[PDB]
Design a protein around this ligand. Structure first.
Ligand SMILES: [Mg+2]
Ligand SMILES: [Mg+2]
Lengths: 139, 165
């Protein structure tokens, strides 16, 4: 159905302050790169740039934050970039959850799984979730 | 030491600055999601008003005799008998929100737990995207009933969308 594919996009973010953001479709293909910024430009200007980017890329309130350190980053952004987070769903896609499931239920596969800039961390998180999909999810 | 600490919360709202915890339940599973021990299940002294009037929880919250300190004592005692310090994750459906409220209001309890979470809703979002057929067949706003459903939902995902050995 029209629009469903867009409603299933993911907003990958990482914070290290250095912040980056990418968009993927539901199959983890990167569709667009967003701002890659250093923050004390001001917090407000940065938020505006990320918010405009996600407004071009995901419909209001429908897409989740994604990454490895994602509930912690969401804790940060809920407070310092609330208008940005308002554009997103409240659920998250926590790759670390899948990592913990892999460790427990697929130890053999976990040994082969992938393990300092924010953009690089996003790249690794996507490759990690992809590894999980390829190797511990039903074919 | 690979056990999971399942927790579900009911609160007066999602505002971390003003709202409080009014119900809380905890279950201990092994890493294959078998329930090993049932922990305390406690009620602590416009959407929320309706949905908590229904289910009788705001009634029970007016009748309760359990303070936040007493609740945290009982939960901390339980997890100290059931899990080794620092090693096990919080698990549940709304677990990052619940962890937000527990970090603020039950800090010793959280300090007994690992920092990693097992978020069933992440798996739900993934199943929705990658296994929509199975997602359609997948699994009372009260803590104990919801955490029990959450375990059953993770189990359904494991049985139906994770690869078979
Ligand atoms: Mg829940
Ligand atoms: Mg609930």
């Amino acid at each position: 159905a029209a629009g469903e594919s867009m409603a299933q996009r993911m907003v990958w973010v990482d914070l290290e302050i250095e912040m980056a953001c990418l968009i993927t479709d539901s199959d983890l293909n990167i569709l667009a790169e967003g701002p890659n910024l250093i923050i004390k430009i001001t917090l407000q200007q940065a938020e505006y740039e990320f918010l405009s980017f996600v407004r071009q890329q995901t419909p209001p309130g429908l897409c989740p934050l994604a990454g490895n350190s994602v509930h912690e980053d969401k804790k940060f952004l809920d407070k310092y970039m609330p208008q940005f987070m308002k554009h997103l769903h409240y659920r998250i896609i926590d790759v670390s959850t899948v990592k913990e499931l892999c460790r427990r239920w697929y130890p053999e596969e976990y040994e082969f799984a992938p393990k300092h800039r924010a953009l690089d961390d996003i790249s690794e998180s996507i490759k990690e979730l992809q590894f999980y999909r390829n190797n511990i999810f039903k074919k």
